[PDB]
Amino acid sequence: MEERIERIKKQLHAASYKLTPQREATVRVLLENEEDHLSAEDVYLLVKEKSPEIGLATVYRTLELLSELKVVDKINFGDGVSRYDLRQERFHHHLICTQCGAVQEIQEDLLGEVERKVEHDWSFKVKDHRLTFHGICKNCQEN
Amino acid sequence: MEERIERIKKQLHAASYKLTPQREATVRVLLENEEDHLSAEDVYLLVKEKSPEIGLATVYRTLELLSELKVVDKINFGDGVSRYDLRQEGAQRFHHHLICTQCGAVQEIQEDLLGEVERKVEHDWSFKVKDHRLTFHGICKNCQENETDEK
Ligand SMILES: [Mg+2]
Ligand SMILES: [Zn+2]
Ligand SMILES: [Zn+2]
Ligand SMILES: [Zn+2]
Ligand SMILES: [Zn+2]
Prior knowledge:
Chain B: Belongs to the Fur family. The structure is a homodimer. The longest helix of chain A is centred in the first third of the chain and has 16 residues.
């Protein structure tokens, strides 16, 4: 058992960096969309646009492996879906449509006035800030 | 077929006022600790302190259903742990947080400081905002004055 512990160990560790081309495909779809903030639905459907023998559960397990091993980050921005964004590694803003899933980054920094107010009001030294907005987007208001 | 669906409807209604006791157990733990932001694991522990004939799956499934219903909100903090944040009742926008990147204090902000800004994004990007999630990161008030006793 004591060495069976070991056998299993090296099984698991192998399973973590040894990448099947099934896993490798989920990674391809991540690298091919860095700015984009992809859901499990998303990464799935795009893996099928090259290798559709894949299986959704495979795609999920792979993502869930990456996020453990701090290569991607699960995030919930509050649209009620966990999104897997890579960490190639003020942070920008997001508008996330709670229907058509349309993301839009805001390049500007609209906080300013708020950032300062906080500081005064709480005696807090701001360094970084991450804002996400929820609302069915321009195009869905017309379709 | 539509008969079978109605049957299924009656099925679930039973299961539900069958299952509410373990629902109430979990909703307690949340309410008792609104200042904390509990991970599912956390809840689980606190619920066997009263109702340990519970099992973990029924707690999670409750937690998820409750964030389905906006009653609570799932939140990572950079610590790679999904945590269930209770929304103050009747609120229209989720609270803000100040996180400390050191000591790790978390301050819910009950006011809504993004009003003028909501109005700007709604304008500039022809968007219809229905909620938001704002978080700041920064060494907090007391960590300014306890690393002025450590240099
Ligand atoms: Mg700023
Ligand atoms: Zn973004
Ligand atoms: Zn949209
Ligand atoms: Zn909170
Ligand atoms: Zn602090």
